[PDB]
Amino acid sequence: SRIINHLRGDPVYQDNTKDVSLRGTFLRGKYDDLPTMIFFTEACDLTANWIPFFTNPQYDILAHRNVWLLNPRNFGNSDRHPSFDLQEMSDDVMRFMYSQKISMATLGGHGIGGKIALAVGCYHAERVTGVFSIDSSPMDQRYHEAFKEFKGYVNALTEINFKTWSDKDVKVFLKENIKDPKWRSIFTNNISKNAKTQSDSFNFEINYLNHNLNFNKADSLGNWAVKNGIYTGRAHFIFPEYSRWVHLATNTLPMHKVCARVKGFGHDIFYVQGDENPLNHWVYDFENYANVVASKLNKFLHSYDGVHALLKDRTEIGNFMIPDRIKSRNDSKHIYGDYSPAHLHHNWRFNHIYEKHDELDKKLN
């Protein structure tokens, strides 16, 4: 109605990787002008599963920012393209931010969606305030057992031919092949019937995804290439204590390797205290995991997101002076000294708040 607004479109198969438009759900915040957050769900996962998380009055996330539950290419409602390059998918978000008139946004992700969110900060750091990654890390996960199961489920899902198979044939095939209960439920909800009861099909492009996973090479979604580079902004990582995707022993090192400003464990990298359970990857289903993720997310958005690198928190905005490098300013008659870095309005490009406040400033003087 008002808070939940998902723009309706039809996926278009595109030959050019630049003519790709992303669709998703928009969640309006409680207050008038708030920065926006763009969040990516796990690969082949519904955006609607995160709606109760982002609209929970106890967590009160919308009090901080507007949330875009956006689908990547070949997923859900967005356009389809055979390439899964993280740079090409990152440029999709920039065209989405432009068409939606968003100057800069916070990026979030779950699982593989965490890699996608962090990749956008790697390729467009000036348009991204921060990255909040849930149960993911910028590392090659092609050989993790959790990814192999997901890779195996997508491969088995290519066997089903929707024209010949009946509905009862599909239900039996999924229960027997997909043993994970959550992956089974997610894949069933991705099945949808086209207009005029033409046939059934998965919402995500099963052909393009299977070739990406089955090939198991550098462009796979499980892999993180060196080509992606380094993210220079604020990054926060949260994952379960016993997670099949992020192992606390060594899978934290990629975060320091890719993110330049990560301080370490206990500051930007936390683990949710929990038991061994293969379903603990889906933090929004369990209140214990969801409460900790939401509190850490509120702390990131409130005090650490979109703050200059050399400032500690948002509390230092306007009272902490950063040293300046010599011969860095165009003015020749400039006395070099410490300064407080400029923080800009979240959508200053598409509004005239700086022009309006200039005129109000002249009325004072």
């Binding site: 609607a48 599963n49 709606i51 109760p52 909800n189 289903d285």
Partner: peptide, 28 residues
């Protein structure tokens, strides 16, 4: 089973009687 699916998403324990009242509310 759309009514069952949305309730399942919110993790609300639903009885069979509630589902019928909601279906009748839409159809009626």
């Amino acid at each position: 089973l759309e009514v069952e699916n949305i309730l399942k998403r919110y993790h609300i324990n639903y009885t069979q009687a509630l589902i019928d009242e909601l279906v009748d509310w839409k159809t009626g």
